[PDB]
Amino acid sequence: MELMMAIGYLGLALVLGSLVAKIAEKLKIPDIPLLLLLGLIIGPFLQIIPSDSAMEIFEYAGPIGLIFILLGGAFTMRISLLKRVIKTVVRLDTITFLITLLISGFIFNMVLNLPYTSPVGYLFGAITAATDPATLIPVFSRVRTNPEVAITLEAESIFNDPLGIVSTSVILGLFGLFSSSNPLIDLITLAGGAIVVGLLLAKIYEKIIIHCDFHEYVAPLVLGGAMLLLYVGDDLLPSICGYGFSGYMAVAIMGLYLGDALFRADDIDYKYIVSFCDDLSLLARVFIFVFLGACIKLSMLENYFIPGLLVALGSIFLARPLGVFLGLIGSKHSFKEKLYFALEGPRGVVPAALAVTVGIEILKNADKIPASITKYITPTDIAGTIIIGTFMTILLSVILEASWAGMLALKLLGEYKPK
Template identity: 30%
Template sequence: MGEMNTADISSNELVLIMAGIATIGVIGGWVAQKLKLPDVVIYLILGVLFGPEFLNIVNIEAFPTANEIILTFGSAFILYEGGREIKLKVLNEVKISVGLLSSLGVFITAIIIGFTTHYIFKLPLGPSFLLGATIASTDPAALIPVFKSVPIKNKLKQTVISESAFNDAFGAILFTSILTGLTMTEKVGLLGTSSKLVLMILIGLLVGIGIALTAIGLSSDKRVGIFHGYAPIISIIVVVFSYEISERFGGSGYMAVFIAGLIYGNKKRFGLWVPDEDYISGVHFRENIATIARMSIFIVLGTHLNLTSLMKYGSRSIIIVLVLMFIARPIVVLVCTFFDKKANWSKNEKLFMMWVRETGVIPAALSGIIVSTKVAGYEIISSTVFMTIIITLLVQASTTNIVARKLGVLEK
């Protein structure tokens, strides 16, 4: 055999790392099933174990492009799947609550956590609010599997799932705006930032709707649906084009993929449908892609973790998590449900919404982006996000059934 050049070695190493991530993910999923724990917690722990801090088998930081692809595409596909889970018919009944929880709620959370971080860690306000925006959203990828095993009342379940999908998009947009402001050389005022945020949302909406309707038509059972046999693959094309086109026009790629998923998940309302055989194969295909995305994001986040930073900032990070769970979240639910008289939320339903707010995929991916860009305070942000994911998933996700039973919000 001839001598391999540096490019060959790099490509071979990259392939091995990707295979290693998949192998670790499969093992982690199996362990999580046996221990009856959220799989993402095991992925995080295995990422730390196999990362540079211990065994150094997976070091994705040596391949920044692959790192960015995993974090960006993975989070975009998860958002797309979250959009598909929302049913517009149910959403219409609780649209005020969902709209406020996923927009105003994100801003309230980011502000409370931002000022708390500024006070506890003495970080500048910019990085402090960046942390707030990173952990402000909840996680549909963690909530949906829990709700499949716990029969929560349908209106309450759809509200929590819808909020988690919408606030992931709003959280990602807020995160992008703050990160852009921190990394730009020229300062942008509040009015400029607000205008850009609105523009990002509008462009994302238009791009997501346009691409989704086009793709649904071409893969439907109508005469124009000449590609219906390729419906599963088209879902990946929709995610990539929605994200990239929106970003290139100055919009939010995350909003675009989420809206595309929302349109796709409610295509019957537009008089379109995919043949049953193609629909079923598409579901299995997307579930596998989403699983790969989840395991990759959390394993990569685990490999990014600096144990020295975690030991240094861990105790103060726990304070941030407690403020998020027991101060920020209750305030958000009380404020955002107050204005929705039509939904007629009971006290116990509000208490349940306060408890169910797991942090997961999108914050993990955004944290990875922060580490990659080396923003001021990135070690503090990474450690706090890690703590938030571990604590909320272990404490809140694992007790959802018990809390729902105690509060009487299970379907009879």
């Protein structure tokens, strides 16, 4: 665990990563594939980090990294704003999200030939359903859409954030359950709890900021404040109850409300935040993608390469696209938004940790207690697949979206000519 090694490797990551990111900025190309390639080079190719070690580092670093990008993603944008294309945004985001997860459960189960009740398939499907913004919707969205869509993508992103947790709970229930007591209270408690206290601080922050003085001192407040939300949510309240409120959704809600409350007010106290959050959110994303890669255990992969690839294509081309086409149908229009609903595959911040976290949770405790469910299916490959599918999942979703985003941003000027 030698510290000097940790700061050394972290140093190499910052030095090489900053340079590569800058080259990308002067190259137009989007970060993510370059981040993954770097992850391979310092990963399998040069053998600079193994699986066990990568996962061990990630157990500590990941929550810190995740708090960074969630905070960075929130501040790089706003709210109020969101309420005009919003009917489509909420119906499509919520209803199409649940349907996509359902689609994910079924194909993943069938391709393996494993039983439908079996939970591994439904987990894989659950991972596909989750979106993640923060790595790519905010990074391309620095520059305009300018219509509806940027706000929605943010909303979709965050909207899931209340969804990804719900999906994780569902996956926990059916793949066997550590606790069978609630299939419903946990949904309430996490979302509702995160909403209440998040609004509590956003309101508190709203008043305290407007009355005075920090300005500048507002940054430690949320960064420590967000930190407390995790401690209260996933450690303190489960300890004192088994009753927790999560934390992640709670900080998401706080950022969502607070950004709007700040922006809504106007005045001198807004410029600076966009640049600061963009710079901050960059280091974490570079580090997270590579560290997300290194967290996975070393040797994944040979057996489940083909299925995960096949599962991925179903999510990108069938589940995603059917979702948008069957979730927007009442639109105008068109041929620009419904297609956007399709192609999904942006999330990768949530499900990633959850994929790996579930992987260690079931695989390690397997010998000690694997709820005796889906053992002979056999899971060994469930844990293995999820990670590649998400990898593959990021790469192809990220690569394709990055390649056609400009074409789908301007090329689709809606051809609306009113005179």
